[PDB]
Amino acid sequence: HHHHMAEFTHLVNERRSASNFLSGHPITKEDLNEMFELVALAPSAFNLQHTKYVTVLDQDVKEKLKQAANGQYKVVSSSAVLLVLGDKQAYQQAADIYEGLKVLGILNKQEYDHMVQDTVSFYENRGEQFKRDEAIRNASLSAMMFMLSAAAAGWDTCPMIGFDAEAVKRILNIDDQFEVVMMITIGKEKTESRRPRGYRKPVNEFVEYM
Amino acid sequence: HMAEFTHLVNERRSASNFLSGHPITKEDLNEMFELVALAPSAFNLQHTKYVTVLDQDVKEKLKQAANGQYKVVSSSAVLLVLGDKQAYQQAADIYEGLKVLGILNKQEYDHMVQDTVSFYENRGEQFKRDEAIRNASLSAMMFMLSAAAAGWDTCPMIGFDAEAVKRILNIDDQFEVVMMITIGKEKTESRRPRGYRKPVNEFVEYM
């Protein structure tokens, strides 16, 4: 129970949003799949698991994403570029996600139908804006987990919103039901060349106790 | 760090209940928030604010706004995670040290401020709100992992009436109420298995 805070504190202190990446650091599907096993364990509303990742390793495709990413060269120099997607229709998979509860005899048919109905109606009652909010919220929780996993694995990342979402969707053939919530580059940054961390507001300027 | 973080992640479970007799202090929370401060945020604008409720009557008010959920009152504290829809307005203040300490000249500083401000202004109100949710949600995940690392359990929650919460806590309409997070110590023997998880090859595609 005893040393988890100090380890985590070091991980968090060492994580810097990359401004550059270095060549000669290829990343493999195996490297990434280890990070994604941790991402799978992120919390998500109603366990709907809203988040999808399109992970681009192909250098020609990365070159082609540069214009879409507001000209940011780090898309090219990165080892991989991830598009973090949120399903605006995530709630439609409630019936499938919850089905094992029925098969394992944890819920009976009525209870399972009720649970699916609670989740679906929560979303449908609130409407389209809420569905999109949920896409952004749940994918962003997931993205933070991705970045800390990457850091733990010894990789650098830069989260990015400086891109044309529509262009990215056309280039990568992403369906309409997915919001492009963020882009994350991953790779190895030269540490000697890093600027110091940007100014942070003190805790007493962003937390109110009541 | 991978073995330790893997352990932390694997352990972390959204709490269904909280035990009595585990008060949390400002000192405890401030330790967590120091890590939260180091989360990334777009343009380093630091969009997120936390309203941290220890007062038991306010928790009762919040419970009424959250479908009567008992964990609101049995929690050691209830946090409201806010995102500032007007965060971009503080660019000039946040970047000011770069100029004053001579890292940037005035032209470069003005250019930096204008780049951030115009990015938000040119996109518009829906974007500002999207940014409030996105950056606050990144922050919330950091908060939950920080709490885990400190030995606390949390439950993220969206099952509440946001307008009722803003009335209870006197929250300006400039802030989006992004999430509620309860914190405390869970009865760990009282724990259902982790809800089914999609395999990685069902949520990741490579190109």
Ligand SMILES: Cc1cc2nc3c(=O)[nH]c(=O)nc-3n(C[C@H](O)[C@H](O)[C@H](O)COP(=O)(O)O)c2cc1C
């Ligand atoms: C949602 C979001 C969007 C971002 N977009 C970009 C971007 O498009 N390009 C970029 O270079 N950095 C981007 N960043 C990185 C921020 O500038 C960075 O997190 C901030 O300056 C703090 O740096 P640090 O994370 O190293 O402390 C983004 C960060 C966030 C979380």
Ligand SMILES: Cc1cc2nc3c(=O)[nH]c(=O)nc-3n(C[C@H](O)[C@H](O)[C@H](O)COP(=O)(O)O)c2cc1C
């Ligand atoms: C944004 C979002 C909203 C949530 N809202 C609630 C809620 O209002 N009430 C609740 O009991 N749990 C809530 N949760 C918890 C989820 O049901 C939980 O994360 C999921 O079932 C998986 O459990 P696990 O995180 O322990 O693996 C929420 C989770 C997410 C991230």
Ligand code: NI
């Ligand atoms: Ni542990």
